[PDB]
Structures are given as structure tokens and as C-alpha cells.
Amino acid sequence: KAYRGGHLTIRLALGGCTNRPFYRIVAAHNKCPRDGRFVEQLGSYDPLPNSHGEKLVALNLDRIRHWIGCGAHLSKPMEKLLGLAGFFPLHPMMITNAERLRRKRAREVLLASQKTDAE
Amino acid sequence: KKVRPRLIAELARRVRALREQLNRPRDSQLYAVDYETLTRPFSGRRLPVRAWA
Amino acid sequence: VRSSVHARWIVGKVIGTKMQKTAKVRVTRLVLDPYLLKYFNKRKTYFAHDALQQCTVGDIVLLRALPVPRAKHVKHELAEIVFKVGKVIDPVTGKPCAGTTYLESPLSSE
Amino acid sequence: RKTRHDPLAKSKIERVNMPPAVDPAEFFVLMERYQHYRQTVRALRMEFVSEVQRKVHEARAGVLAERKALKDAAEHR
Amino acid sequence: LTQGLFRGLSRQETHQQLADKKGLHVVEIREECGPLPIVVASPRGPLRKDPEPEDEVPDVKLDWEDVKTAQGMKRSVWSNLKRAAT
Amino acid sequence: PMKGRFPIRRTLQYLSQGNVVFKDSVKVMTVNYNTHGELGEGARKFVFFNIPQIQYKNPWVQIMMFKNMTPSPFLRFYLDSGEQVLVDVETKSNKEIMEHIRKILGKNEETLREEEEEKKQLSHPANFGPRKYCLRECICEVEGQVPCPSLVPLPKEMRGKYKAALKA
Amino acid sequence: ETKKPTFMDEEVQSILTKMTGLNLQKTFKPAIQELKPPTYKLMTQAQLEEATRQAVEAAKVRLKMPPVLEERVPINDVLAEDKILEGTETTKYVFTDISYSIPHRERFIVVREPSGTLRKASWEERDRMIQVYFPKEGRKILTPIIFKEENLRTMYSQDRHVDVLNLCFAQFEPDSTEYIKVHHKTYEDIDKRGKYDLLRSTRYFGGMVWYFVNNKKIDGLLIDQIQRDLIDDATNLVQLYHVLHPDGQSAQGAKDQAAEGINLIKVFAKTEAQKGAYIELTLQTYQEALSRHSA
Amino acid sequence: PYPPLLRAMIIAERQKNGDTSTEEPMLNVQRIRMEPWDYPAKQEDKGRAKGTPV
Amino acid sequence: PISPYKDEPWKYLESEEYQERYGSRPVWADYRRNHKGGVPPQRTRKTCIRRNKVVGNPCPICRDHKLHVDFRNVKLLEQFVCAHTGIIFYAPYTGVCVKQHKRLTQAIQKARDHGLLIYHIPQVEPRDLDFSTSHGAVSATPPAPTLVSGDPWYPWYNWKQPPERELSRLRRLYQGHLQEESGPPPESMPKMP
RNA sequence: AUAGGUUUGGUCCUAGCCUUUCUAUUAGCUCUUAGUAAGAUUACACAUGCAAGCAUCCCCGUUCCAGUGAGUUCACCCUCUAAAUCA
Ligand code: FES
Ligand SMILES: [K+]
Ligand SMILES: [K+]
Ligand SMILES: [K+]
């Protein structure tokens, strides 16, 4: 299906069953359906902790580099996975979200302390 | 394999392209704005709230 | 060197010479019958540009693809007449032959 | 999803999307992180492009590729 | 059927009869035993010293049904059905 | 039984036993053979037995055969460059002819091995997808990973039907 | 200066290869598997001897000894410590590079811990991940229960040692702690109960001999070899012991006495061999029987 | 610097090829000129609203 | 009924009663399914015992209550495996119901996992051609300068308080749509006491 | 297909029909729970609601996704070469 314009993107295609998500990392045309035609499969991502307490991520790093070198864009969740792997720098929004959580939890410790102290 | 010509598809295409050049809207039409409702009367679309001031 | 014509080199039998500077050539390929797994000839007609009009009906010719088609159906040119009808030169010995008999003995020129 | 020809909903006629409030400190810090992040990622992308372009050339006109071509031509002759 | 079955089974050539007629060893090759050559029969008389001529292409009559099955061309909903132990 | 003499020739097993895979230069192979004469027996056997094997391995090469046009049998190959390779086959056996053309115009065993290894890389063991293309369809098949809900019901806490009820 | 032979040295390989032996009937024992109708060939004696020779060649490939490797050192290398990510995620991420054409021991497998540390995966995690993505026939992601002590004793009680070793070779890597532990435990049961014939004509005999020689307990194997009229193997075993322990009482004894053939066993029996008395009696019995047959 | 993983993979290739060096691999970001987001774009390549009037 | 062998199921197969009933033939030797036609249904019945009530023609396992399908009753399990090939007979072969065939398959696998039932264990090749552990992937990578000094990998991970002039400029741009300014974040993640 | 029933007073041959196996819809009668997958007969006509916005104005997007199977060798390979992505 020849689309008007568009570009290749490395993104997460949702698989699995209800309440059991499983993602396949694929380089696909921007306009293609999420779970439809893709150019190449570049890995997988199990977001559910396994028996060993691990979230498994597969990354075909040789082919990910090839497709980025051919002009493929990246989805935000994919950029964040590459950051956690150490292949890219940490995405700014993971840093900011980590800081937002720190501030939230620091504010939570005040009310908790006041209750135990005042009462 | 010989595709049957579609002449009306080519006629309409040329007519449309021509009309788009002869009836093209002017800058004074496109980029007008109602300063009370803050909408472009050409399309009736509101401007973003951050451009209002 | 690049050509848009699919068949680059093909051998065929000249079957018609009624068009001007165009020889109609029948080309046969062996195609596998999927059920019987036996090879049967499949034939296709090719128009070949014959600038000098030297093709005779029945001669075997080698066609080379033209860079681009010169006419609606003329996609090849006469590269060589492999066997002239009734005037075959034995490629192995280079002597004129009539079927399976030498017209000039290969021993004439040693 | 709707097409350009489908009419707009009546309920949404008067919907005005108000933009979010801006935290000055977080806003400036976040703006710089985006600039630094995208500079590093654009440098990485450039390296990956050069690698892709080098491999294509190496297969087409590389020393090993051209050596094999001559060897094959010699063996044919 | 009965008369045909007894006619065929009675006229079968044992491995010993083959070795004696051919004057050659009958060597059994089993996939479960790898390349081990298992000699099932040897010629009781003298053993020929010339190897049996190996015909490049065997001029044997093949049953289409066998060939058709080996090529995965035979679909049958009735073949290889689960049945009681016989 | 199967029709014709030597029915083995009409089996996929026999047709895949040819060892002659022409180089990409070969475009047309012409076979000139005589139907009678003892000096042409090998060429006749080569046409009877081996042309099907050669064609099966080289589907895009045109093979054309000509009977009783010359006193002696010969092969001629037309290469894409325009070179013509004449191979005289008189007095040779059909096996010798098959071996001669493999040497001069056939891909060696190394070249074929490489092509087969390139095909191996097309199918990646780690890729998950339909059985036609991949070994496993879902990660749930891998032991240790959370199993498919169709086989093992997920814990009530991991199901969205109850993630909302507990919250509200 | 003077390097002691490694397991893969040509000299050691020749000695251990001969000590193993080649029983074609044991090497190609009929496997209990899905069967097909056997094929038959009419063969001359010359052709039969050529096929038997080819079976000997194939059997020697099947018996190629696995290389004995030293226990791998635990991997504990931290690539980075992004402390900002501490507390954001509750579960660790394992990232495996699944690029096809990479040797499995040169693949980068890293773990992002909940603390934010990006560390290289441990040997155990590495092996588990390579099985998940490059599944090998006969290997399981979760360790089979057969390797527990109680279950291995059952396998030994049934004289299924070669099976235990084939299971271990498929599951664990040669330098893994589990691999070396299971192999040694099997080697120690063979020694205690004198079951050295179980591993003969298998690729696991050399490893068993190598284990015994480097731990100085070649007594049981020597006795068995003599009792079975395998002096050539017994002498070679004593010789090899001397080469791997050159500065030893027996090695010096043989040097001092220039012992050869049966003498080497006597010299070793008295000096170093723990069961010196039993060896002499066993060797005595053999030499007496041999003298009779010579007559 | 290169990010954690990429750095480790570049250093491993050095050691594998035999090159023994302690220099740090680093990305040359001097070529990348990050312009502000409000830098005037090219008006020649920009489109125009269509004729449909309200 | 209550069989006395549930605790030691292997005993029944060595008792006199078993030898009188079965002898040396497998327990399923005499069973015959009742079905219409010459070709039987390709599945056996789901279960021979429904709500503690046995059907008319109980399968070989369900007709004898003393036969216990247990991973330890190796002699009973062996009867349901091919001695020459080692494959577990499919249920139509012996006539066991689907319920008992599933239990038999699980017990056979458990016995094989525990080493009680012998099965063909093949000799496999090594996973790796080379066993060297010298590559950086498995060795120790030289620590990066930032890791040695304890700094963040990139300087922009850390929060740097913006200058006051820039904050005032943002406060003019977003007049009337401003949040409370946020200072530097906590140095580490707090925790609920 | 491992086959079976059926021509005749009877036998043999040939032959069609049907039986036994496995699925999918619909109908009758009947039906406890959980998880999962799947789910108009009709390219017939459609009440009502919703399904495309975003954004300091310009542009961009609404040409996608989603739907259907009416029509029907435009789908694949090669040659050549636009638009598009690689700031
Ligand atoms: S198929 Fe894997 S979760 Fe259902
Ligand atoms: K009938
Ligand atoms: K916009
Ligand atoms: K249709």
C-alpha cells in the first residue's frame, strides 16, 4: 500500500492476549496499522515480570543501527527503552518524571511526619 | 491488460486545478480576523488562546 | 548496457518475414508440468529488428534485447543467424553440412 | 476516524482548549535537556548514517569486492 | 485377497536366499544404528570378488501412489487415522 | 505404475540431484544431437537423463534442442557478455558431459554453500510471529514468562476487570 | 621453561584416545527412537571392509572428547550508575543483543537494576537469555530437577552415568559451576563403585581420566585395567601420571630405575599409589596367568 | 561521551581487533548546530490555506 | 471403593490378584471400544467416571480402581509407552479416556524427569565454537571517567537552577498561567517511614 | 482409507450411490462456574449521539487509522525514476 509521504519508524507493536501485553519492536511505515505490515522485526519487549523478576527486552542492535542510518524515526516509548539499555542517553522526560516523583514523595513525607508528630 | 481510459477523471482534475487558480482566496480573505470573537471569518476557526492578547 | 527488456538473450526459429525489417521469431522454453513433472516446450513469439532483411523462414537466430523498445512489439534485434535454413556450417569442424553428412570433408583442409 | 468531509459535532462547537500552566524552573531546565538530548542523538544518527553508507560502498567497490570480481573473471578466462 | 496374500507371502525371498543367489553379503543399514554395517546374511558358498554393477539410473517401475506420497501430494482425511492397537 | 520408460526421471528427488548450477552469465544453452550413430550415444543419454536435471536447477536459462542438423553432437552456451562457449560432446558419455559443463560453467560447491548461509540469516530464531515465519508466536510460550490467560487464568490483581473495582 | 601438558595436547589426546577404546557396537547402539524400514546393500568383502572403516571414522568423530575448561569467573562489571532513576522502576530490565552473527560469548547482555545501575549480566543470566532467544535443542531455561542430589543418586543406582553426563552437557556450559560439579560427582561415583567400563568407548572417558590423574586417585582405574587385561592402557596411565606430576616419588623412581612396561606399575604401586598392596596382588595374578598362555 | 552501552561496545571492538588504547570514545557534537525553535523557517516551502470559504 | 495400594501403588502390579487378572499382557490388551462404523472416533470419551458414577464400558485404567497412575508406578506407566520407539501411545491406541491419558502423560514425564523411567538422551554438540572469555562483553570494561568520579554520565541529568533573568522572562511569557516555581529536587528518593 | 453396505435365484467382474472420520453454520431439545478466542444473512434503507484535531495566528493533520467484499488478473520481479524520510 503506497502511502502519501510518510516515513519508517521503529515502534512497539502490541501482541498477546487480554491483560497479557507483549510488544514486538518493528520498523514499519508511519501510516501502517500498529499491528499490521512491518519492514523488519528488531526485537521484543515483555512488560510483565517473569518468574525471576525480570522484564525481558530483545534488541537487534546491528539492525536498529542500520535502520536509523536509513532515516527511520523513533517512537517515544522506543527511545525510552533504548535509554534504559544505555544505547541512547536517558530521555529527558524520564529524568523529569523521576524528579517529579522525588518531589511528590518528599511532600508525602511531611504530612505523614506531621500526623505522627502533631498527633 | 489494456486499461480502459477514464476521461472524466482527467477532465475534472484539470478543471479543479484551474478553478483553484482563478478562484484562489486572497491574503485579505484568508488572514482576516474578528477581534471580538477572535475567529477567522473565512473558516470560522478560533485562534489559539495564547495568541489572543 | 542496462535494458528495460526482460529477455536479454534468446534463440528462436524465424516463422515470418512479411513485416519490413522485422522478423517474427518463435522462441521455445522448457516448462515443468507440476503434476507430471515432465518438461514440455512452451513457445512465444518475438519480433526482431532485421535492418538488412537477411532472415529467411526456418533459420535459427540469436536475438539481443534492444536498450528500449523501438516499436510496440519490437523489443529485440537480430544478433546472429545461428543456422541458415539449408545452409548450415558445422561449428565443430567449420565445414558445410547437409543434415548429418558433410558436404565438404573435414579432411580436405587437413 | 472522521474524514475532512464529515461534519463537526455540535457538542464541540464551543470547546476552547485551555493550555497548561507553566512551571518556570522546570520549564527552563526541561528545555535545555531537550536541546542537549537531541544534539547527542543527532550526532549518533550521523554516525549510523555514515556506517550504512560505508558498508554499501564497501560491497560495491571495496578492495575485497573488486578483488573477487577480478579473480572470477580470471577463472572464467 | 486370501489366496493372493498367501501367494505373495509364500513367494518371498529371504536374506539368506538372496546372499546365496548373488554370492554377496547382505548388509543392513539402520538409521537408529547410524553407519554401523550389520551383515544379516553371507553367501554359504564362495563369495564373489566383483562388485554388483551400479546402474546410474535404475529402470524400475514406480508406483505413482508411493511417489505421490513421498512428494507430499497425497492428501487423505482417512489416512493415518488413530486406531485401536492391532 | 508410472507411465513411460525410466519413470524415475519424473520425480522431485531425481530432478533435485543435478549438480550443475550455471553461473549468472549463462543465458541460453543449445543442444545439437543426432538421433542415430554410436558416436552420439552419450549426447542422446545426456538429453534423455540430464536436461531435466539441468533445467530444474536453472529455471531461467533457455534450453533448446535441435535434432540431426550437423554430423556430430555439440553444446553451445550463450553468455550475457556475448561470448559463445562451444562444447563438443561426441564420443563422451552423459556423465562426462555433465561433469565438463559443471567445471567450465557451473558454480563451485563453495559459492553454493555461501548462498545457502545467506538464506539462513533471513529467519531469525528470536523473532516472534506466525508459525509460517517464526518459531514461536508469543513470549508466553517461553517457560518462566507469564503464561497465556487462555491456558492459565491470570491473578485477579493483574486483570483490568478488578483493577477498577478495587480502586472504585 | 617446562610447561606441564594441557588436556588438549596432542600427546595427551593420543594417550586418552587409546585408553578410551572403540567398541563399534557400543558407540552405535540401537537408539529407542522413531524407526524407519532399514535399507540393504549387496556388498563384497572389500566393500564390507570399506563400510566398516567408514564406521570407524564416524565413530571417532562421535567420540571426540569435550575440552576440559576451568570454572568461569563471575562477571561483576558496572557500566554506569544513573542514580536519578533510583526508585522509578520496581523491576529490573534485561537487555539482550540479538544480532544474529555474533558469537554467544561476545554478546552484550546488560541489566538495568531498580537502583539505576546498568551492569553486565551474570554468567547465569547470560546463559538463560541465550536460551530464551537462541533456543538450543536439549537445553531448558529452568534448571531440570534431575540434577538435584536425590535424583542424581537414582540415575547412578541404575548405572545411567553416561546419561547424566549427556544431560549435563546439553543443559550447562563446559565452564559452568553446575557442569563441573555434576561431572565431578559422577566421576566420584564411578570411582567408588568401580564402574569404569560404563564410560569406555564414549567421549567422556578422557575427562574422567584427566580428573583422576590431577587429583591423584588413579588406583581404582589401574586395578580395573589390569583385571581386564589392558596393560598397555594401564602403563600409559602410569606414564601420563608421571608427566603431570614430574616432581613425584614415582616419577623419580621410574627415572632412577629407568622402568618401562610393567615395571612402571610396580614402581608407582609402592611409592605413591595409595592401594600399593592391592595393586601388587592384582598385577601379580595377571602376570602369572600371562605366563601360562605363553607356554 | 557515548552513552553507557555504546561506549562499552566500541571499547570491546578495539580490544577484539587488537588495538590497545585507553582513549575515551566521544561524539563530535561540534557539527550539530542546534538552532532555537523560533528561528524563521523557509516560507517558500510552506503551504497555503485552500479556497473553501465559510 | 478404597484400594489399599494408593500409598504404594507399585505393589499391586506385583501382587497375585494382578497376575490372575492380567498375567503378562498389558492392562489394556482386552479392552475394545464400542462405536458405530469401522473407523472409530478420533478422540476417546472425556471421562469414564462422572460424579462418582462409572460408565458402561470403563477404560482400562478406570475399570480397575487399584491401578494408580503415579510417577512412581513405573511398571504401569511402561505399559503405555512404546518399547521400541519410546513414544506415548495416543489414547485411541489403548482406549483410555482423555482424563486418564492426560494423567498418564504427566506421570510419564514426571518419572522421566526424576530418572525413574529410562528414555533416549541424545548426544548433542557444543553451543559455541570458541570458549574464550576474553571479549569485553564478558570481561570488565574500563570504567568511564564520569563513573570513576561519581558524576552523572551527561551533565544535563543533574538539575541546574536556571538564572533569575531567564525565570523572569518565562514569567512574562506565561503571564496569568504560571505554577509555583520548583526548586532543586531531593538528592535521593524519599520513603514512607 | 486398513475399509464397509448395496445390483442377482446364485457366482465373478465393472460401476454408481451410501456408511464409518474431521470441521463450519442453522434448527430441535437441553444447559452450572471461571478464563480465553471469535462473533448481521444482505454494497438494502437508516432516527439519535459520538468517531480530528493541534497550535502564539502561518502551516501541518483530517489522503492515516477504522469499514466492507460490490467490482476484479492495478498486488509480484526487473528497468527507469518523482514525491517522501535521513535537521
Ligand atoms: S498468545 Fe501469548 S498471551 Fe496469549
Ligand atoms: K461398491
Ligand atoms: K499544527
Ligand atoms: K468482492
Ligand SMILES: [Mg+2]
Ligand atoms: Mg526525490
Ligand SMILES: [Zn+2]
Ligand atoms: Zn477412563
